[PDB]
């Protein structure tokens, strides 16, 4: 899954 | 009436709850400092700082959405305020607007005295503008932290993780103790498949933000990337707890799309009893199954 910045 | 402020507010009866917002998002945290910002919101719409530190809080607490509504108002207010061309720049960057990533990369650079004067399919052009004009910042001043964070929000656009990453250490390198720039190493290093090294930036970021949302949620994303479902456990229910503080009726759906990615963790890890009672909403009886509370 994607993280987020 | 583009803000979908909370309804359930104490400090809207408050009477300075912008300097309250300010000291709670060191000694109280997030959700309810965001409460203080969305209360002086509403009182004083004009007041642009308002709106500022209400959108980068929201963004810090896992809802970009609601950064962006914030940010836009600061972005009226003052488009010379370079934090919050550099917040909507990461709030887009992360919800995949292209477009405005990019226009909030070139704002945030072009509104700086000291840089004004200066293939990716979604958007060829507007991204070469940008690499373009950042990377003749760069050599105008190699030491800019914030031109290297912002390299590195450009790249990660593009999914060059490897130059982002980089970028993105040069400026942990100036500012070892700012946990924004920690965190977007992580987030780097975690889409980039580095999940180890990731969790490295992750933990910089939490010694010196305990209370950064944002960052226990990317601990628990890279934690379930590599299927250590306890471990990913653990940081949402921390995740979880620290987003609501107070009460939530948007919210709701934030506070439940977290509470269904940790359910849906419970049940790959082969739990069923610790599933059905996510449905009650209670965090704590998670802490404590989770070694976080006694």
């Not at chain 2, 709850?17 to 000291?23: D, V």
């Not at chain 2, 950064?67 to 934090?83: E, G």
């Not at chain 2, 929000?153 to 490897?162: Q, R």
């Not at chain 2, 799309?257 to 996510?278: A, G, K």
């Amino acid at each position: 899954e994607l993280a987020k910045l | 009436t583009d803000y979908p402020f909370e309804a359930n507010n104490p400090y809207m009866y408050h009477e300075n709850p912008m300097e309250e917002g300010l000291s709670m998002l060191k000694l109280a945290n997030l959700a309810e400092a965001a409460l203080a910002f969305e209360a002086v919101c509403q009182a004083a719409p004009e007041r642009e700082e308002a709106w500022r530190s209400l959108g980068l809080t929201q963004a810090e607490n896992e809802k970009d959405g609601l950064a962006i509504i914030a940010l836009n108002h600061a972005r009226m207010l003052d488009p010379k305020d370079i934090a919050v061309h550099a917040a909507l720049a990461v709030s887009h960057t992360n919800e995949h607007n292209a477009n405005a990533a990019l226009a909030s990369l070139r704002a945030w650079l072009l509104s700086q005295p000291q840089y004004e004067q200066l293939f990716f399919f979604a958007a060829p052009n507007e991204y070469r503008e940008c690499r373009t004009l950042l990377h003749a910042a760069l050599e105008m001043n190699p030491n800019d932290a914030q031109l290297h964070a912002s390299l590195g929000v450009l790249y990660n656009l593009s999914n060059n993780y490897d130059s982002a990453a980089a970028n993105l250490r040069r400026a942990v390198e100036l500012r070892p103790d700012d946990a924004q720039l920690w965190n977007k190493l992580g987030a780097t290093l975690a889409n980039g498949n580095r999940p180890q090294e990731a969790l490295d930036a992750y933990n910089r970021a939490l010694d010196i933000n305990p209370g950064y949302v944002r960052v226990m949620y990317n601990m628990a994303v890279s934690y379930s990337n590599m299927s250590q479902y306890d471990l990913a456990a653990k940081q949402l229910v921390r995740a979880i707890y620290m987003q609501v503080g107070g009460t939530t009726p948007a919210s709701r759906e934030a506070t439940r799309s977290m509470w269904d990615f940790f359910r849906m963790l419970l049940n790959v890890m082969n739990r069923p009893d610790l599933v059905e009672l996510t449905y009650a909403q209670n965090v704590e009886p998670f802490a404590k199954e989770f070694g976080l509370q006694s």
